[PDB]
Design a protein around this ligand. Structure first.
Ligand SMILES: Cc1nnc2n1CCNC2
Length: 182
């Protein structure tokens, strides 16, 4: 409907896939080449389904800050026959707060969904389903089961991936440019 949705739509159409693990279906953001991100609670194994295609996982690391605290981001390298559009130039370099964000989701259950979540706080520390977690972004929208992995964007920036909520607020793990230097 406007410039926020236009940026979000561009990321969803070219840079997302449907990832299925033994823990369910997730929005998965492709970042560059065969490299994508997914919430660590997806529990990525040796084999993952990508748009219902059986895919070998070539390498996978969980992201953790230098305090040895969970960031809730898993980076995955897929044995896929096609590269993603490189979107690393849309990743912020530093922790920040934001105006006017959209949360975008694409699953079997929630196809082509775009939520205007408004203002995004650099919240920092969150106890996330019992796990101390750093670099959390917070927005005042009552997000639900099915939205994990959902991509959080502003006009010009891909800022995070949705990892939880409490029924009043939603929470996203920051994406930073330094996670994806090759
Ligand atoms: C690409 C990339 N960046 N960090 C990681 N990877 C794939 C292997 N695991 C960790």
């Amino acid at each position: 409907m406007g410039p926020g949705f236009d940026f979000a739509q561009a990321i969803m159409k070219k840079n997302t896939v449907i990832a299925r693990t033994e823990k369910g279906e997730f929005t998965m953001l492709g970042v560059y080449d065969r490299v994508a991100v997914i919430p660590t609670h997806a529990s990525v194994g040796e084999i993952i389904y990508i748009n219902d295609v059986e895919t070998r996982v070539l390498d996978a690391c969980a992201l953790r800050d230098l305090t040895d605290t969970n960031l809730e981001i898993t980076i995955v390298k897929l044995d896929r026959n096609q590269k993603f559009r490189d979107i690393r130039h849309f990743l912020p370099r530093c922790e920040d707060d934001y105006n006017d964000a959209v949360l975008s989701v694409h699953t079997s259950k929630f196809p082509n969904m775009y939520i205007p979540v408004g203002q995004v706080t650099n919240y920092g520390f969150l106890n996330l389903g019992g796990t101390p977690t750093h670099r959390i972004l917070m927005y005042n929208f009552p997000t639900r089961a099915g939205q994990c992995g959902g991509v959080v964007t502003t006009t010009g920036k891909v800022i995070g991936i949705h990892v939880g909520g409490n029924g009043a607020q939603g929470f996203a793990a920051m994406l930073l440019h330094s996670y994806f230097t090759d």
